[PDB]
Amino acid sequence: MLSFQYPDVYRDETAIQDYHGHKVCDPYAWLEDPDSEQTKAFVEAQNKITVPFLEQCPIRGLYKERMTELYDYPKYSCHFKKGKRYFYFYNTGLQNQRVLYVQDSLEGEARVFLDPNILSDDGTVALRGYAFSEDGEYFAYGLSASGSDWVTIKFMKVDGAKELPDVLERVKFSCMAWTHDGKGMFYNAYPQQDGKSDGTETSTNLHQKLYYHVLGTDQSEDILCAEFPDEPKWMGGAELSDDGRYVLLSIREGCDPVNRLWYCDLQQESNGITGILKWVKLIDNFEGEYDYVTNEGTVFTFKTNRHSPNYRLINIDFTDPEESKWKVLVPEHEKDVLEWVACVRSNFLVLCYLHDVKNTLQLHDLATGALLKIFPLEVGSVVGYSGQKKDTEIFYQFTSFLSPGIIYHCDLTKEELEPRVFREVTVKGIDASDYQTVQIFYPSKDGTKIPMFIVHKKGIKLDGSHPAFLYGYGGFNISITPNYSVSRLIFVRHMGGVLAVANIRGGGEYGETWHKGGILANKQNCFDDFQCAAEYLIKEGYTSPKRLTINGGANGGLLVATCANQRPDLFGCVIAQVGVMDMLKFHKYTIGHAWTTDYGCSDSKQHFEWLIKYSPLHNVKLPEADDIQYPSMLLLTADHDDRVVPLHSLKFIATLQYIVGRSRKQNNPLLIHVDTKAGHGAGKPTAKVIEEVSDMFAFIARCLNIDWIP
Amino acid sequence: XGFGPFG
């Protein structure tokens, strides 16, 4: 029979709530309290059955060993210049956290500048955001403990890497920007709250404020520069214009790519920064995004999606601000998304486009917007870039499914520009030439063509005999572009698998129209798109239902969990990482209120009607057909995940085990693993990353009985 | 500072 027994989990049958006339029972609502002895006992009981299941078969050890070996390669970030020095991140291979290095010259010897590894035994203290003073002589950096979004900002004098006394607490979702006079720095902080603020609490985050910290003073002396007491969800991030004249405030409410844009000419302040600034409300609504690129006097260049879903560049003159007067510097492309733009060497613009989910990099003239040079790239993604207005060179990093990456360098003072390979590392053991990456477009239920990348060993027969790993996200205007993953390549090489990534709606692959096609009333399009990706892989012979594994994280966790409820017959295995499972209550915790722009909010009758149909927690149901059971499922979360509070996964697994786990026909396991000293994922130490992928693939291996291929 | 359920 089964190899283990599911834990006893109390059902509060009195937990009933009325949603617009619809009665909803939430028997596991008590799991919403992370501090109770009841919840702690539940987590321990679940981990007690999951760990032995994952470690029983020797395949986990074989995988972990191969991952440790293959992932052990030098990892560099591209160089960036600040003041008179160069900086770059580098991990010898298996250090828990990458280290920040500094060199006084491009050819000079480098030395350790900031090593987060020495801040904890297990590498659970990580760098989260940083900002150098304009002259590059001072450095502010954020540290997060145990994977929490909470940040503590510390300071250092660059020359001699001297630690300073300045410490800023209660920082979260904060920008960091120094005024060019070198006096201090703008940052965001939240008011004091009852209970903990370490990542284990579920408390909603409201009333974020903008402060200014004068270097050499106590945080209690900080100046409040902006606040929105009547709009608790507004978040204002500050940045200084390239010439240091203006503070630009980008105010956001929710997750859509839109923002208010206010500015303050610092020279117009009566006596420096002493209180709420004299904000000029240039764009005082949430109808479009205005991303600062650079300015020349009062003429500001912004990347925008205002009446341009694929994005474009516009110049707004603060002295003649009306929309009818704006100049369109670089018009919107009919299909290619303008992902980001930077200004370098005074009058050059670096534009990065996404063409059929692949990146292109171009250099344009700032005055006219004319194309000047195309920087050639293979099929993949640009994941790093450096080069600000005063710089005379650029560095950019390229990655793809089969290559770790290449860091390029280009001296922009040269007449005939030509980038050169600055750094390149290959992984011995993974001969990229034994594999191939293809891109196909499959029709979804409504006929819309969806892109999908498929990576596999060359020459395989499309006889449906291969295990497959299909990944998706689908939301928040996030484009899922090619990236290097040793863990996935081990699945291909050592488990004979096929990798697939479906660029479903909700994402940003085809601009804001793509995004809107997967949100609110149309969120079901994401699930349909993904299910259709699975059907394609099956019909085309890459895999079969019992050999197919789907995976996603956060909004992607919601994706795969919903797909399991809707089409349990289509998948053999489902791994949902830190997923949003309770779609009726997500807005109640931490930063969840910001996601209503993609999902809607249950308080609304209309939204509730969309949400109730797909919410994973509210759609667990035994398959009607006797020959159909739920696929094997593994939920992965961590106790400091304050982005997507773990109660989502706790309640979902309790429900899966009770409604489906108790059925005689259910033989596939439904498990959860809650990690400690970890959170949503950012900053997770290498050691934990390796344990995680080892758990994932051991689960797939055991559930589908896959033999290891040495 | 990316406050979405990104993963």
CA neighbours closer than 13 Å in the CB half-sphere of residue A646: 29
Q: Cα A148 to chain center, whole Å?
A: 14
Q: How far apart are CA A636 and CA A560, in angstroms?
A: 13
A673 and A690 in a single domain? The answer is: yes
CATH of the domain at A105: 2.130.10.120
Q: How far apart are CA A17 and CA A666, in angstroms?
A: 30
A470 strand-pairing partners = A500, A550
Token pair in block for residue A451: 């892109």
* Residue A380, burial from CB neighbour count under 10 angstroms (0-12, 13-18, 19+): buried
A278 and A401 in a single domain? The answer is: yes
The residue behind tokens 């027994």 is A5
CA distance B3 to chain A (A): 7
Q: How far apart are CA A647 and CA A34, in angstroms?
A: 8
Helix A605-614 to helix A524-539 angle (10° resolution) is: 20
Q: How far apart are CA A647 and CA A661, in angstroms?
A: 19
A320 strand-pairing partners = A317
Q: How far apart are CA A351 and CA A498, in angstroms?
A: 33
Integer CA distances (angstroms), A579 to A18, A48, A236, A552, in order: 25, 21, 27, 8
State whether A151 and B1 contact (CB < 8 Å): yes
The SS3 assignment for A533 reads helix
Contact A145, A139 (CB under 8 A): no
Q: How far apart are CA A618 and CA A565, in angstroms?
A: 10
A237 strand-pairing partners = A250
Q: How far apart are CA A631 and CA A213, in angstroms?
A: 53
Contact A549, A575 (CB under 8 A): yes
φ, ψ of residue A533 in degrees (nearest 5)? -65, -40
The residue behind tokens 């089409």 is A567
Find the CB nearest A173 among B1, B5, B6: B1
* Spatial CA neighbour of A155 closest among A247, A240, A61, A218: A218
A134 and A230 in a single domain? The answer is: yes
Contact A611, A585 (CB under 8 A): no
State whether A555 and B3 contact (CB < 8 Å): no
Token pair in block for residue A585: 């209550």
Residue of B nearest to A555 (CA): B5
CB atoms within 10 A of CB A466: 22
CB atoms within 10 A of CB A142: 22
Picking from A371, A394, A426, the residue at the C-terminal end of a domain is A426
* Spatial CA neighbour of A573 closest among A549, A593, A546, A603: A549
A330 strand-pairing partners = A313
Find the CB nearest A175 among B1, B5, B6: B1
Integer CA distances (angstroms), A376 to A380, A469, A484, A688, in order: 11, 31, 19, 36
State whether B3 and A591 contact (CB < 8 Å): yes
The two beta strands, A393-399 and A406-411, are antiparallel
Q: How far apart are CA A698 and CA A669, in angstroms?
A: 13
- The H-assigned helical ranges of A211-327 are none
Q: How far apart are CA A332 and CA A313, in angstroms?
A: 8
A128 and A62 in a single domain? The answer is: no
Q: Which phi-psi region, left, alpha or beta, contains residue A694 (left: φ > 0; alpha: ψ -120 to 50)?
A: alpha
Q: Cα A379 to chain center, whole Å?
A: 22
CA neighbours closer than 13 Å in the CB half-sphere of residue A288: 19
State whether B7 and A557 contact (CB < 8 Å): yes
The SS3 assignment for A688 reads helix
A639 and A526 in a single domain? The answer is: yes
Q: How far apart are CA A634 and CA A577, in angstroms?
A: 8
Buried (b) or exposed (e) across A611-627, using 16+ Cβ within 10 A? bbebbbbbbbeebeeee
Interface of B with A in 1-7 (CB under 8 A): 1, 3-7
For chain A, give the longest Cα–Cα distance.
78
The two beta strands, A280-283 and A290-296, are unpaired
A419 and A431 in a single domain? The answer is: no
A251 strand-pairing partners = A236, A260
Q: How far apart are CA A358 and CA A336, in angstroms?
A: 10
Picking from A426, A456, A472, the residue at the C-terminal end of a domain is A426
* Spatial CA neighbour of A26 closest among A615, A524, A601, A633: A615
Domains in chain A, number: 2
Query: Which helix (H) or strand (E) segment is A386 a member of?
Result: strand A381-386
A242 and A352 in a single domain? The answer is: yes
Q: How far apart are the first and last CA of chain B?
A: 15
Picking from A367, A394, A426, the residue at the C-terminal end of a domain is A426
Buried (b) or exposed (e) across A639-648, using 16+ Cβ within 10 A? bbbbbbbbbb
Integer CA distances (angstroms), A541 to A466, A532, A544, A549, in order: 8, 14, 7, 15
The SS3 assignment for A258 reads coil
Angle at A592 between CA A588 and CA A596, to 5 degrees: 100
φ, ψ of residue A450 in degrees (nearest 5)? -115, 130
A104 and A151 in a single domain? The answer is: yes
A302 and A338 in a single domain? The answer is: yes
CA distance A549 to chain B (A): 18
- Name, in order, each residue with C-beta under 8 angstroms of A325's C-beta and a sequence gap of 6 or more: A317
Q: What is the DSSP string of A455-514?
A: EEETT---SS-S-EEEE----TT--------HHHHHHHHHH--EEEEE--TTSSTTHHHH
At A645, which amino acid appears? V
N residues, chain A:
710
* Residue B2, burial from CB neighbour count under 10 angstroms (0-12, 13-18, 19+): exposed
Q: Cα A626 to chain center, whole Å?
A: 40
A478: chain B residues, CB-CB within 8 Å? 4, 6
Q: Cα A645 to chain center, whole Å?
A: 16
A188: chain B residues, CB-CB within 8 Å? 1
Identify each DSSP E strand in A83-137 by its residue range.
85-91, 99-103, 111-114, 125-132
Contact A709, A495 (CB under 8 A): yes
Find the CB nearest A555 among B1, B3, B5: B5
State whether A255 and B4 contact (CB < 8 Å): yes
Q: How far apart are CA A204 and CA A63, in angstroms?
A: 39
Query: Which helix (H) or strand (E) segment is A299 a member of?
Result: strand A299-304
Q: How far apart are CA A536 and CA A541, in angstroms?
A: 8
Q: CB pairs below 8 Å between A and B: how many?
A: 53
* Spatial CA neighbour of A536 closest among A494, A501, A490: A501
Identify each DSSP E strand in A179-245 by its residue range.
184-189, 209-214, 223-226, 235-240
The SS3 assignment for A538 reads helix
- Name, in order, each residue with C-beta under 8 angstroms of A345's C-beta and a sequence gap of 6 or more: A387, A389, A391, A392, A393, A412, A413
The SS3 assignment for A588 reads helix
Contact A172, A144 (CB under 8 A): no
Q: What is the DSSP string of A11-74?
A: --TT-EEEETTEEEE-TTGGGG-TTSHHHHHHHHHHHHHHHHHHHSSTHHHHHHHHHHHHT-S-
Angle at A280 between CA A276 and CA A286, to 5 degrees: 100
The two beta strands, A573-577 and A632-638, are parallel
What is the structure's resolution, reported in angstroms to one decimal?
1.5
Could you list the residue range(s) of the whole structural domain that residue A149 is in? Answer: 74-426
- The H-assigned helical ranges of A622-685 are 647-655
DSSP letter (8 states) at residue A199: S
A12 and A121 in a single domain? The answer is: no
Q: What is the DSSP string of A307-375?
A: T-TT-EEEEEETTB-SGGG-EEEEPPPSS-EEEEEEEETTTEEEEEEEETTEEEEEEEETTT--EEEEE
State whether B3 and A577 contact (CB < 8 Å): no
Q: How far apart are CA A109 and CA A9, in angstroms?
A: 59
Contact A697, A495 (CB under 8 A): yes
A41 and A85 in a single domain? The answer is: no
Query: Which helix (H) or strand (E) segment is A282 a member of?
Result: strand A280-283
Buried (b) or exposed (e) across A228-262, using 16+ Cβ within 10 A? beeeebbbbbbbbbbeebbbbbbbbbbbbbbbbbb
State whether B4 and A555 contact (CB < 8 Å): yes
Contact A449, A442 (CB under 8 A): yes
A-side interface with B, Cβ within 8 Å?
A: 129, 149, 151, 171-175, 188, 235, 237, 255, 473, 475-476, 478, 552-558, 577-578, 580, 591, 594-595, 643-644, 680-681
Buried (b) or exposed (e) across A383-410, using 16+ Cβ within 10 A? bbbbbbbebebbbbbbbbbbbbbbbbbb
A523 and A619 in a single domain? The answer is: yes
Q: Gaps (C–N > 2.5 Å) in chain A: which residues precede them? A: none
* Spatial CA neighbour of A617 closest among A655, A589, A573: A655
B3: chain A residues, CB-CB within 8 Å? 149, 173, 235, 255, 591, 594, 643
CATH of the domain at A64: 3.40.50.1820
The SS3 assignment for A521 reads helix
